[PDB]
Amino acid sequence: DTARLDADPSASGPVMEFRELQKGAYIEPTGAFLTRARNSVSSSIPYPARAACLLVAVSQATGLPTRTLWAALCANLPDSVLDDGSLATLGLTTDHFAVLARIFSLRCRFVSEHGDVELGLHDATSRFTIRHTPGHFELVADNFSL
């Protein structure tokens, strides 16, 4: 289903996987998600200031400023892939990471409950490891308060 992507005024050309749009030595399945080239429209989408953990993690690992990571994303993804509706609350995904890996030459072993997944490029000059914990519910005391 590419409805939002076909209707995106910030996109141009045909729909294809990102790893086909920006070819590189990707670690399968990095970049498999569908996207379109970004045209000249400038992104309104603001920096996800309340959901920036992935940018922070990559910034700490590489010394790359978070605003630079964000600028690179805004130049290389159309708005409908940059923000599928949940960016401001759930933040970036490993789809976004694929773009950062291609531009900045990165590879990261993502550690999660069900198993590790390494994403990025086989010829990356920066390598690091990030723990991914998914959203989840936990039973707490009746009068629990943050």
Residue numbers in the entry: 9 to 154
Give sentences copied directly from the paper behind this entry.
Maize rayado fino virus (MRFV) is the type member of the genus Marafivirus within the family Tymoviridae. The polyprotein characteristically contains four nonstructural domains that comprise the viral replicase (methyltransferase, protease (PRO), helicase (HEL), and RNA-dependent RNA polymerase (RdRp)) as well as the major structural coat protein (CP) for genome packing. The main function of PRO is to act as a polyprotein processor, but it has been shown to have auxiliary function as a ubiquitin (Ub) hydrolase to aid in bypassing the host innate immune system by removing Ub from the RdRp, preventing its degradation by the Ub proteasome. X-ray structures of MRFV PRO alone and bound to Ub reveal unique structural characteristics that differ from TYMV PRO and notable conformational changes that occur in response to Ub substrate.
PRO adopts a compact, three-domain fold, although its C-terminal conformation is held in place by a neighboring copy of the enzyme. The second domain (green panel) is predominantly a well-ordered five-helix bundle (⍺3-⍺7). Helix ⍺3 contains the catalytic cysteine nucleophile (C61) with its solvent-exposed thiol group at the N-terminal end of ⍺3 (Fig. 5A (arrows) and Fig. 5B). Domain III terminates with what appears to be a flexible loop that is solvent exposed until it inserts itself into the active site of a neighboring copy of the enzyme. This loop contains the active site histidine (H144) that is ∼17 Å from the catalytic cystine. The asymmetric unit (ASU) is composed of two copies of MRFV PRO with most interactions occurring between the alpha helical bundles of domain II of each molecule. The C-terminal tail of each copy of protein in the ASU traverses into its neighbor and appears to complete the active site of the neighboring molecule. The catalytic C61 and incoming His144 residue of the neighboring symmetry mate arrange themselves to within a few angstroms of each other and appear coordinated for catalysis. MRFV PRO is monomeric in solution according to size-exclusion chromatography, and this dimeric interaction between the monomers of the ASU is most likely a crystallographic artifact. Interestingly, aside from the terminal proline (P142), our crystal structure of MRFV PRO reveals that the enzyme lacks a complete GPP motif.
